[PDB]
Design a protein around this ligand. Structure first.
Ligand SMILES: C[C@@]12O[C@]34C[C@@]13C[C@@]1(C=CC(=O)[C@@](C)(CCC(=O)Nc3c(O)ccc(C(=O)O)c3O)[C@H]14)[C@H]2O
Ligand SMILES: C[C@@]12O[C@]34C[C@@]13C[C@@]1(C=CC(=O)[C@@](C)(CCC(=O)Nc3c(O)ccc(C(=O)O)c3O)[C@H]14)[C@H]2O
Lengths: 411, 411
C-alpha cells in the first residue's frame, strides 16, 4: 500500500513570488488586489485583479524560450522549478522514467490567443505565430518542465476550470499510489487577467465591480459580496511515494491521505442551493482517507465571493460536519489573493499544508457582516492559532459542476 | 481486483455520424477529407480537412442550449448521448453517485473564441457573450453530459493535445478500478477546423498542403507525406466495472486491460528520432496488462502523416515488438479520417475495440511508397482479415511530448 507525501513546494501569487513570502502575507491578512494597468480598462465593468508583481524568470527561462510561451506557462515553469529545487530531488537515468507531472490550467494562454487572433484579423493567417498552439494550450507547462528536467514518467494535464489544481494534485497522487510513478510535480497555473478573461467573466456577471475599493471587493460570506476577483499565479507541489522520500532523506511537509470527486449535475455556472455536490466531494475525500469529519481542523474553502456559490459551500460544510460544524475552522484565502482559477486549488493545497506545519490558519478578510442564519467559524479578519491539528481539507469547485476535495495529514 | 469493460460506444467522424457507419467506411478504405467551405481559405496554405458532414443535434440538444456551446461541445454531447443510449444503462438515485465522466479536448472552443474576440475587437468588452467561458472551455462536454444524465460521480477532463482521448479513457478506467465509480462515460471531442486552427497548425508547418488532392494528403509512412490533416469529431465509450456490467446484463464490447503513459522530454512539437517515449508508453501498457508484445495482434498507431513523427513511432514499434515486429499489424486510420486531435485517441480506441469484435483491421490508405529500411506491416491500402486476435493496442501522442497507450482484450 503506497503512501504519498509532499516534498517540495513552489508558488507565484498576488501576495508573494515565493512560497514563504506568500504564506507570510496571508497569515498577516494582506490583500494582493490592485487596479489593472497593462490594458485600458475604461470600458470594463471590473478594473482590478490579483496580479503577480514584478514576475522575474531571467535566470530560469532562456530568452529564446520565453518568446514561445504565454505568461501562464512562464508562471507555471517558475513555480515548478521552485518546487523541484525545494525538493532536492536529483534526476538520474535510473530515475527519469519514474518521475512525471500532472499540471493544468482552467483557461490557458489567453494573452497569446488574443495576440494571435488580433494578428489574423489585421493581416491574415500569414501573421499567426508558428508558436500559436504550443504557446497557448493547457498541457504546455507539463511539457516544458518535463523537457527541462528530463522527466520521462507519466505526464497529464487536467483542465476542469477552478477544480484543476485539486484534480491535478489528486490524480498525481493516484498515479504514484497505483505504482506508475514514484514522484510527480503537480499543480496549476493561470494568467487570465486579460481583455477576454476580465471581459468574459464580466459578461457572465460573475465578477465583483467594486472598483472604488479593490482590496475590499473579495469578501466571501459577507452580505455585500458581488462576485469573484480574478487572480493570477501558479502553485506546484512535488508529491513522492513515502519510502522513496525517506530513503533519500527528503524533507517531508505533509502526507496526502484523501482525494474526493463529484459532479453537481445541476447548472453550468452555479451550484445547487443544497451544496449536495460539494458535500459528496468532501465525504468521498473523508472516506478515502479513512477518517471522520470531526478530525478535520481546517477547511480551505472554494469560497469565491459570489452570492450563490458561498452559500452552497456553507450548506455543504454544515451537512458534512454536523454537530462539529462550528468547531471546524473554515477560511477563504481568495479574500486576499483573488480566484486563481486553474491554479486556485494548487496554491490553496499549499496553504492547507503550511497550516499543518505552522499550526496557524489564515483569515477570511473583509467578512464585516456575514450572511445570517449560519453558525460556521469562517475565521473572519484575523489569523488563528490552532492546537493539535492533524488534518486539513482543501475544496476546489468548477464551472460544469465539477468538484474536488483533498485531505492532508500532518507528518 | 476490479476489471473494466466497455459497454457503450458513441461517435461522430469525418466518415460517419454513428459508430457503425464510421467503422463500415474505415474498413472500406473511404477518405473523409474534403475542401473547406465554411470560411474563405484563399489566404490559407491548407484548404481542406476531415469535416463532420450534416451534423444533426435537433432531437438531442435543445435550441436554448445549443446557442450556449461551441461546436466541439455539441459534437461531444451527441457522441456521449449515443454511447449512453447504446449502453442501456438506467440512471437512478441509487446509481447517480457512482457514474461519472472523463472527457476532454486538445484545443476546445476555437470557433467561439474567435467569435467573441472578433466582437471585442469590433465593439469592446460589452459585446462579449455572457457564455464566452462556459461555451469554450475544455471541461464543458463533461459538464453538460453530467447535467443531462444526472451523473453525480467523479468528473474530470484531461487536455493533453492529441493524447487527450487516450488519457481520458485510461484515467476513467483507473477511477473505476480504484473504486471511485462503477461507470464512466469517457472520450474526447474537437472542432479545430477554424481560421485559428488551420492557420495555427499551418503556421507551425505541421499540416499537409496537398490542396490539389485532399484525399491523398494524409499518407502515414509514405515518402511523399508532408504533414497532418486536421479532422473534427468526437468519440465516447461507456466504461464499466465488470461485475456491475454482468449483473445488469450489459452488452460487453471488450475489456480495457492496460494503460501506459510517458513523456519524451525532448522537444515541444517533435518526438526524438529514437521514439523512446512512444516505446516506454507501450511497454508500460503491456506491463499494466501483464502481457508480452507478441500477444498484440494490431496497433492503431498515432501515425499522423508527418515526416518525423511517423518515423519515431515505427522505430518505437520495432523496439517493443523485436522479432515479432513484422508479425504485428500496424495501421493509421488518420489516413482516412485526418487527425481528430483531442478526440483522436477516443475514436481510435473505438476502432481498436471493433477490430477485436470483427477480427478485421482497417488499412493505412495512400501508402504508395513507404519509407525505406522498415519491415513493419502497415496494412497498406486494403483492410485485413485477422484470425485469433485477442488484444489490440491504441497509441496517441501529443505536443509537449506526452504519450499514452491503451490495450483492449477480446471478451
Ligand atoms: C447564471 C449565474 O451563474 C453566474 C453567472 C450567473 C448570474 C449568477 C447568479 C448568482 C451567482 O452567485 C453566480 C454569480 C455565480 C455562481 C457561482 O458561484 N458559480 C460557480 C460555480 O458553480 C463553480 C465554480 C465557480 C468559480 O468561480 O470557480 C463559480 O463561480 C452567477 C447566476 O444566475
Ligand atoms: C519544429 C518542428 O515541429 C514541427 C513544426 C516543425 C517543423 C517540423 C519538422 C518535421 C516534422 O515532422 C514536424 C512536422 C512534426 C513532428 C511531429 O510529428 N510532432 C508531433 C508530436 O511530437 C506529437 C504529436 C503530434 C500530433 O500531431 O499529435 C505531432 O505532430 C515539425 C519540426 O522542425
Amino acid at each position: 500500500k503506497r503512501r504519498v507525501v509532499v516534498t517540495g513546494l513552489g508558488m507565484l501569487s498576488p501576495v508573494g513570488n515565493t512560497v514563504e513570502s506568500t504564506w507570510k502575507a496571508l497569515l498577516a491578512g494582506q490583500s494582493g488586489i490592485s487596479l489593472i494597468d497593462h490594458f485600458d480598462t475604461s470600458a470594463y465593468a471590473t478594473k482590478f485583479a490579483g496580479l503577480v508583481k514584478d514576475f522575474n524568470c531571467e535566470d530560469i527561462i532562456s530568452r529564446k524560450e520565453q518568446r514561445k510561451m504565454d505568461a501562464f506557462i512562464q508562471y507555471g515553469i517558475v513555480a515548478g522549478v521552485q518546487a523541484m529545487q525545494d525538493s532536492g530531488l536529483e534526476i538520474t537515468e535510473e530515475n527519469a522514467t519514474r518521475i512525471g507531472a500532472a499540471i493544468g490550467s482552467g483557461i490557458g494562454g489567453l494573452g497569446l490567443i488574443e495576440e494571435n487572433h488580433t494578428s489574423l484579423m489585421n493581416g491574415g493567417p500569414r501573421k499567426i505565430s508558428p508558436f500559436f498552439v504550443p504557446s497557448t494550450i493547457v498541457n504546455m507547462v507539463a511539457g516544458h518542465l518535463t523537457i527541462m528536467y528530463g522527466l520521462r514518467g507519466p505526464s497529464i494535464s487536467i483542465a476542469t476550470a477552478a477544480t484543476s489544481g485539486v484534480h491535478n494534485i489528486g490524480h498525481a497522487a493516484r498515479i504514484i499510489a497505483y505504482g506508475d510513478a514514484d514522484v510527480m510535480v503537480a499543480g496549476g497555473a493561470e494568467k487570465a487577467s486579460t481583455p477576454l478573461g476580465v471581459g468574459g467573466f464580466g459578461a457572465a456577471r460573475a465578477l465583483s465591480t467594486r472598483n472604488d475599493n479593490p482590496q475590499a471587493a473579495s469578501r466571501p460570506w459577507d452580505k455585500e459580496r458581488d462576485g469573484f476577483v480574478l487572480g493570477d499565479g501558479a502553485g506546484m507541489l512535488v508529491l513522492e511515494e513515502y519510502e522513496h522520500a525517506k530513503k533519500r532523506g527528503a524533507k517531508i511537509y505533509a502526507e496526502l491521505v484523501g482525494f474526493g470527486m463529484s459532479s453537481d449535475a445541476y447548472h453550468m455556472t452555479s451550484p445547487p442551493e443544497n451544496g449536495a455536490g460539494a458535500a459528496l466531494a468532501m465525504a468521498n475525500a473523508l472516506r478515502d482517507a479513512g477518517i471522520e469529519a470531526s478530525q478535520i481542523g481546517y477547511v480551505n474553502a472554494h469560497g469565491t465571493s459570489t452570492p450563490a456559490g458561498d452559500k452552497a459551500e456553507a450548506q455543504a460544510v454544515k451537512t458534512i460536519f454536523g454537530e462539529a460544524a462550528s468547531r471546524v475552522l473554515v477560511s477563504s484565502t481568495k479574500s486576499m489573493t483573488g480566484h486563481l482559477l486553474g491554479a486556485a486549488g494548487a496554491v490553496e493545497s499549499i496553504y492547507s499544508i503550511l497550516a499543518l506545519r505552522d499550526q496557524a490558519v489564515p483569515p477570511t478578510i473583509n467578512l464585516d457582516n456575514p450572511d445570517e442564519g449560519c453558525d460556521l467559524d469562517f475565521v473572519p479578519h484575523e489569523a488563528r492559532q490552532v492546537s493539535g491539528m492533524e488534518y486539513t481539507l482543501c475544496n476546489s469547485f468548477g464551472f460544469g459542476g465539477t468538484n474536488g476535495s483533498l485531505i492532508f495529514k500532518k507528518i
